[PDB]
Amino acid sequence: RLGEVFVLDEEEIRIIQTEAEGIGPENVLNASYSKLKKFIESNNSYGATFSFQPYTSIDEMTYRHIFTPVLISSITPDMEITTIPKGRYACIAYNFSPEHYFLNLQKLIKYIADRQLTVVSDVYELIIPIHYEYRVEMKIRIL
Amino acid sequence: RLGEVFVLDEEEIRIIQTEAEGIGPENVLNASYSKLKKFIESNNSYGATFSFQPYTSIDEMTYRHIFTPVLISSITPDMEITTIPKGRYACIAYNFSPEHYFLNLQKLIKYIADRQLTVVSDVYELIIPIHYEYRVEMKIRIL
């Protein structure tokens, strides 16, 4: 159940997110996901969102928004309150590793190409720090 | 039922939206809502989104994203597919007029202050062109 696409029915998650001014996977892979954290320092797990495309290489990618799940007021603009709507999701979870990232993205991409699915959201990249290493849940909404 | 806050339970609307690079109400009031249209020319009604705050003046405001309801593929990034989640909304509809805009915003703002409600989204400004004049539906998600 780790390193393979599954389709689940998620409930809705409330989040706080902001614009990911330029930053992309290429930058996080040149460091740690700790980078995104910085954008949202103003919950415990964080994430990024990016347009779903059949990318042929990381460089083509660029994140759109950095977000964090919530659990509320006194929030400035430049930070938005939204959710990750309840729905059917194609998910692929793995332990973070540069080599893995692109590879898994490809699996998800292929999984949707075949199965001729219809995506209705961006790819959500959820980072979950594992403290005894990162856990990554890549998912995208489908119809 | 026109020019007063009501709370309804909307279903979910699928939309396409983009970043509203700087643009705000102050600019649309100096022209027509036709301005926003331009941002999303790449449905029939369009809209804008902005952070919910107890604004004391239009100038303080700046739009966040311009969007349009949908009804699907071959979409570039720089354009995002999302929704206006189903939920309970505090809505205020009126016929567009510069004088009205701020005034009604105030009503909605007051309505939430009293009633001590909890908003969980940005203010959605839905523009509906009336062709025999504009119709504006200002709404924000509540808990």
Ligand SMILES: [Mn+2]
């Ligand atoms: Mn945005």
